[PDB]
Amino acid sequence: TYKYVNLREPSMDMKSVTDRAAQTLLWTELIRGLGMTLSYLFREPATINYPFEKGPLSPRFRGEHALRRYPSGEERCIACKLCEAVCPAQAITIEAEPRADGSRRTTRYDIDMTKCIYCGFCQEACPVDAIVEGPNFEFSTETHEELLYNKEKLLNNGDKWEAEIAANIQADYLYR
Amino acid sequence: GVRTSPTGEKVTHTGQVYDDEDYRRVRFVGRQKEVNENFAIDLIAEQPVSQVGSRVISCDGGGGALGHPRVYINLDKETKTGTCGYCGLQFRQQH
Amino acid sequence: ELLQVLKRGLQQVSGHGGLRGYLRVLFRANDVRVGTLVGEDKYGNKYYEDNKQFFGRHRWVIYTTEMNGKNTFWDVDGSMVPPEWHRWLHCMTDDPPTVKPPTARKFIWTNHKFNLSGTPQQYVPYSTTRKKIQEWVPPSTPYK
Amino acid sequence: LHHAVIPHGKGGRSSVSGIVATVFGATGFLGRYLVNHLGRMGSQVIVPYRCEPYDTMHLRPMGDLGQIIFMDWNGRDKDSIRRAVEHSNVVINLVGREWETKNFDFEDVFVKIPQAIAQVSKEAGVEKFIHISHLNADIKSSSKYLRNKAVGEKEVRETFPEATIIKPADIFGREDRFLNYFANIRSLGKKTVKQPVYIVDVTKGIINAIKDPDARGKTFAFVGPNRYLLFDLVQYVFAVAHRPRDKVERIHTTDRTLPHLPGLEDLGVQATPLELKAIEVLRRHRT
Amino acid sequence: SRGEYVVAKLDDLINWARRSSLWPMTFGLACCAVEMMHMAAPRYDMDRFGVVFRASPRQSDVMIVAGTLTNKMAPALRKVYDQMPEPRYVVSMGSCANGGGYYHYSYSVVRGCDRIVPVDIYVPGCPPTAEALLYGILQLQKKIKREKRLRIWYRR
Amino acid sequence: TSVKPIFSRDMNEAKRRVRELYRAWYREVPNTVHLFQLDISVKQGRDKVREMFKKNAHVTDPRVVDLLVIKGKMELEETINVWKQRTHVMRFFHETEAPRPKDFLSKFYVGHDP
Amino acid sequence: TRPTVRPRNDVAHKQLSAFGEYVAEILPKYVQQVQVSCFSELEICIHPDGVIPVLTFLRDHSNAQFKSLADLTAVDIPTRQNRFEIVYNLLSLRFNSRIRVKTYTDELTPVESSVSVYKAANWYEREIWDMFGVFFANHPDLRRILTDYGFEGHPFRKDFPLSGYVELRYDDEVKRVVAEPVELAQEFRKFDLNSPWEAFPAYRQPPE
Numbered sequence A: 001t002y003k004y005v006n007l008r009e010p011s012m013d014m015k016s017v018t019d020r021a022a023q024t025l026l027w028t029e030l031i032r033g034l035g036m037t038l039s040y041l042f043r044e045p046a047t048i049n050y051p052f053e054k055g056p057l058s059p060r061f062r063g064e065h066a067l068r069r070y071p072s073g074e075e076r077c078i079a080c081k082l083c084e085a086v087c088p089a090q091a092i093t094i095e096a097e098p099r100a101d102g103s104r105r106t107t108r109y110d111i112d113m114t115k116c117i118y119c120g121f122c123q124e125a126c127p128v129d130a131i132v133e134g135p136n137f138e139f140s141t142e143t144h145e146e147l148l149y150n151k152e153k154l155l156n157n158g159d160k161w162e163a164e165i166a167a168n169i170q171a172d173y174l175y176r
Numbered sequence B: 001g002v003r004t005s006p007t008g009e010k011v012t013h014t015g016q017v018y019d020d021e022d023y024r025r026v027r028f029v030g031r032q033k034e035v036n037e038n039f040a041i042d043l044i045a046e047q048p049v050s051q052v053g054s055r056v057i058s059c060d061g062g063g064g065a066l067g068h069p070r071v072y073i074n075l076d077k078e079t080k081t082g083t084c085g086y087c088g089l090q091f092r093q094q095h
Numbered sequence C: 001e002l003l004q005v006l007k008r009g010l011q012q013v014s015g016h017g018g019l020r021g022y023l024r025v026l027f028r029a030n031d032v033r034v035g036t037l038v039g040e041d042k043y044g045n046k047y048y049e050d051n052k053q054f055f056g057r058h059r060w061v062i063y064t065t066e067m068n069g070k071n072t073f074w075d076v077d078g079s080m081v082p083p084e085w086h087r088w089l090h091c092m093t094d095d096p097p098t099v100k101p102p103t104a105r106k107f108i109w110t111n112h113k114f115n116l117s118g119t120p121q122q123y124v125p126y127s128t129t130r131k132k133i134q135e136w137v138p139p140s141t142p143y144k
Numbered sequence D: 001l002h003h004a005v006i007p008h009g010k011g012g013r014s015s016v017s018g019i020v021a022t023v024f025g026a027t028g029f030l031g032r033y034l035v036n037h038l039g040r041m042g043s044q045v046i047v048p049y050r051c052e053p054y055d056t057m058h059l060r061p062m063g064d065l066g067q068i069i070f071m072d073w074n075g076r077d078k079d080s081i082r083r084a085v086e087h088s089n090v091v092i093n094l095v096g097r098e099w100e101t102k103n104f105d106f107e108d109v110f111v112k113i114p115q116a117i118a119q120v121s122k123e124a125g126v127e128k129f130i131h132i133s134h135l136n137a138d139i140k141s142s143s144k145y146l147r148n149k150a151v152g153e154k155e156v157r158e159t160f161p162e163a164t165i166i167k168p169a170d171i172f173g174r175e176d177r178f179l180n181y182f183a184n185i186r187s188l189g190k191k192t193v194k195q196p197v198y199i200v201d202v203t204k205g206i207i208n209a210i211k212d213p214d215a216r217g218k219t220f221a222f223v224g225p226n227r228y229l230l231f232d233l234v235q236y237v238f239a240v241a242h243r244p245r246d247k248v249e250r251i252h253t254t255d256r257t258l259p260h261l262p263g264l265e266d267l268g269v270q271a272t273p274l275e276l277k278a279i280e281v282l283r284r285h286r287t
Numbered sequence E: 001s002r003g004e005y006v007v008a009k010l011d012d013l014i015n016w017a018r019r020s021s022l023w024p025m026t027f028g029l030a031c032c033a034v035e036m037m038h039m040a041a042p043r044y045d046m047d048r049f050g051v052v053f054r055a056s057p058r059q060s061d062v063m064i065v066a067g068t069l070t071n072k073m074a075p076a077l078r079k080v081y082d083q084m085p086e087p088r089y090v091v092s093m094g095s096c097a098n099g100g101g102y103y104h105y106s107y108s109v110v111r112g113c114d115r116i117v118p119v120d121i122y123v124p125g126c127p128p129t130a131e132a133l134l135y136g137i138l139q140l141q142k143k144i145k146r147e148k149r150l151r152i153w154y155r156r
Numbered sequence F: 001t002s003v004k005p006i007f008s009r010d011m012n013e014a015k016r017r018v019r020e021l022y023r024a025w026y027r028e029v030p031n032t033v034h035l036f037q038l039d040i041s042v043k044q045g046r047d048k049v050r051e052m053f054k055k056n057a058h059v060t061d062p063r064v065v066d067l068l069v070i071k072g073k074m075e076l077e078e079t080i081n082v083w084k085q086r087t088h089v090m091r092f093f094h095e096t097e098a099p100r101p102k103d104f105l106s107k108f109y110v111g112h113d114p
Numbered sequence G: 001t002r003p004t005v006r007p008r009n010d011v012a013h014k015q016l017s018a019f020g021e022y023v024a025e026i027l028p029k030y031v032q033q034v035q036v037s038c039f040s041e042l043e044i045c046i047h048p049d050g051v052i053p054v055l056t057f058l059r060d061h062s063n064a065q066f067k068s069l070a071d072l073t074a075v076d077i078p079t080r081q082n083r084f085e086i087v088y089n090l091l092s093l094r095f096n097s098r099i100r101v102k103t104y105t106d107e108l109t110p111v112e113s114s115v116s117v118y119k120a121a122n123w124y125e126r127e128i129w130d131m132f133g134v135f136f137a138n139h140p141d142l143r144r145i146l147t148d149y150g151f152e153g154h155p156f157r158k159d160f161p162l163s164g165y166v167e168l169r170y171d172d173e174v175k176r177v178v179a180e181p182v183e184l185a186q187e188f189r190k191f192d193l194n195s196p197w198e199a200f201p202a203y204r205q206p207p208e
């Protein structure tokens, strides 16, 4: 099973050698290439308009780093540090404290947006699906202080939308 | 839901407020500190407590494979409220 | 046949609303395929879906003037969209979002406050942490 | 004082030091080198600028992550300057453009601008209020620049008396005024005593005074080492540079020594001479 | 207010002229370079926005720095940066270059391009998708809309 | 034990190669300070060359001295070429403080330096 | 044992047994360990005198061709008088067989420079000189590849830490890029993940 190329010869039929001579002096196949390029000229462009139209995607995209909360309930994170244990550049920084109620909680839940690399390990690792990779990707920030997410930054980023995230998970919790 | 500092700023749900002996107030100049005005404490006590008259009861969090795993909690006091660590919502029994 | 293309191609401008309706969207950016009128929603924005064009130019949006008081007649941003139309518009789904828009949860914002970096109102980082080691207070009562 | 205002560990690049400096100006030259030394030291700098953010953008990557902070201001309003010096351990005044302008002549910038800022710094609780000034600023004539700086020294000594009036000589550096005036030229000849001093050890003396107290209260003056003849020095500039009215009268007139107030020697810092730094700065000639 | 109004429209003119084209030089070390060449792709066009890819550094307006910037790379980076004219902007693309990121605890690697060049537009992602990068370039153009340069020269 | 040599037999060949290396560097420095358009006089550069040679002067094993000759020869070739840039030659110097003396009292103020 | 467990072939195992015994017989001078793994790839563990004889033999001898050369590194192992391990990797052409030739060395002894017997060892050996530290005598050019020109210390060693000792930054004082001692911004919090209870009892070292 080997199919090799570049084992041929210019056969010395007079029509063959005068066709190679016509190719040398007349540029036939060059005009053939121009014809192919004009055939792609008279097509339509496969473009979009960016501020109006947006490109196709999938529900399993990894975006925003948003948190979630229970239906009429509490913060979904219970500070179990698994996202730090699988964060491959250690952008997850957790310092946890309980409160006087009895349920355990946090103090500090921070992400380096420099060090995030968008695996999916902190989605596949979170045992209650608290941290969820968001749907969108528009950060584009003019300063560098404004890419170090605090806990309440993540809460308002998860409460600016969640029905989006809920729709993505509700569509595709079966596969993963 | 949130408070107002004696210095004129806000607290979070965690009490991390400042004083006049701090320079992080002067790095908050001109840019409004984002802070969630909807806490996580008051979304539990407002909910009335579920009442199921079994002995060892179940919890998932409202749905299969969406929420927290199957945790079985107990109601074997006379009047105290058993509380799931995952749910954060109490239960009572009716014998 | 060339006069049948000019006769077909002039109707979508004459059916756009006239001439000064088409003046606005042509000076804005590009849109010339108007004619489906699927859905309007909050911030007054308009969502037009055609099926005759290819996959990528199904679903487009026309923004409005002063959606939150920023004079957005020109210079439209991303994340000026509501989240259910944000599900519809990236084509992660293929259902219109007016079939089931909301969730029955009372904690979700009504603004969808857009890209805020570069304003007098933007984000800063800080330490959500209480007192570190609780440094000692000298005796403020006057001894001696 | 509150924690995380105390120093921490060693020095440099998020090794956090104790000083917090509100630096007026700093978009210009000497303020830029001073921000540079405070970034190497590992402090926090608050720079206000009355300009486009592009200039503070090109001086932005000096500090570490989120160390230097930016704001905007004008020289008329009390509240904006109060917002500038809300919380600041030290504050320095470096301001003044060397020509009369379309809205601000030399009068009342050097007078009125230190007034309100020294007022709010006295009513703001700062130490080491360091105000630059020129050498030989007197009521003697020939420069509105010099007489306005004399009245400015008078006011900064008058209110807030623990204010470090600090006067260097005609400093020379990578964006010098008079060295560029020497190079880009073509003019007359007199003789006048003159001493220059290079900029980086001058601002080393400034950061020593701003990091170590007991040097407050009194005023300081920086003195260059050489102090020789003008015309031979300009010939030195041409001979290393390969080629054979207010500012020019300021360099024609005088540069005298003042043995009253101390300088580089008693503060404990070494000032480098003219020649090595002059070779370092005299680039950009032909070929 | 005739001079103020005509100088304001003049500033609008020159800012619109600068935010029109902005053809950069594409520096492009690692796989963010392939993502830049794929935002030269027919799905997302740079040349709808006056953005011509051209590695001529003397006539480059903005500079996208992307890839894993190394300590062996940095001096040639800043020597490229010096011979580039004073209207200049820096778009730091990619988790390697906008703060170190994944190779952050590593020798011979710059801890992000904050420590080398002044930075204007951070865009994160790995890879930052062509939609996100193009959103960042439109936000750069809106920064060019908000500049007030000639107003500052007027009331200076 | 059978220690294979690098280059030598005793300290004789080691001292021969290191005095050859110092001869080459001493006739090599003014070429670089003439070429790279540097900023430091010839006296200070030669003083730091002889300081770097006097720093490592407590070793008597000949293999170590031969491997230092190898390191110096690698940098001598990469400096007689322009394979190194201006940054590396300036990086040999220390004009970026580091101002702390080895005084006990200054280490007591700028603390935690035993 | 039958589902989802990777099987192995007896034929390859016994042929590599016979071939390892063959080579170890016909080179009595330089054979210390001849081992076969459970997945049939041959390993031969070697005294560092006969580098050139072993490689001239294994390039040739007409019943084991082995022209294909793969990597070479002296993978750092402490707790030995001879720390570093030069790991030659050899792959046949006519035979489809993989052998690993590990010879040993310490920090200050030259191996005999495989660049003459295989032309492919040039940049491999230059890199392993720059990154480990074993000098290679009678080699033409050893320079620095994959490092900065002022970055010495042979960083792949276990003595070299995770961060470097230099941190470059631009300063406008001397108007250029300079080097400083490192001052990181985050700790690289290190974990204790070597859990006890002996997951593989077949590899227990015998205690005293």
Ligand SMILES: NC(=O)C1=CN([C@@H]2O[C@H](COP(=O)(O)OP(=O)(O)OC[C@H]3O[C@@H](n4cnc5c(N)ncnc54)[C@H](OP(=O)(O)O)[C@@H]3O)[C@@H](O)[C@H]2O)C=CC1
Pocket: D025, D026, D027, D028, D029, D030, D031, D049, D050, D051, D075, D094, D095, D096, D097, D098, D104, D109, D132, D133, D134, D135, D167, D168, D169, D170, D171, D172, D177
């Ligand atoms: N040899 C020398 O050069 C010596 C100089 N000095 C003094 O040191 C100071 C620093 O030097 P240098 O950098 O050359 O001077 P600058 O002109 O650069 O410093 C003034 C700063 O304030 C800004 N500014 C200009 N006009 C005003 C105004 N009306 N109100 C507020 N801010 C204004 C300047 O420009 P922008 O608006 O763009 O920010 C600049 O940022 C100067 O005051 C100088 O007189 C003292 C002794 C010797």
Ligand code: SF4
Pocket: A083, A086, A087, A088, A089, A090, A091, A092, A111, A115, A116, A117, A118, A119, A120, A121, A122, A123
């Ligand atoms: S996706 Fe980001 S935060 Fe999550 S584990 Fe990966 S690098 Fe860490």
Ligand code: SF4
Pocket: A076, A077, A078, A079, A080, A081, A082, A083, A084, A094, A125, A126, A127, A128, A129, A130, A131
């Ligand atoms: S894995 Fe999930 S629940 Fe656990 S600490 Fe991380 S975010 Fe919280």
Ligand code: SF4
Pocket: E030, E031, E032, E033, E066, E067, E068, E093, E094, E095, E096, E097, E125, E126, E127, E128
């Ligand atoms: S940030 Fe990601 S995509 Fe970009 S160069 Fe680094 S690894 Fe590649």
Ligand SMILES: [Zn+2]
Pocket: B059, B060, B061, B068, B071, B084, B085, B086, B087, B088
């Ligand atoms: Zn529960």
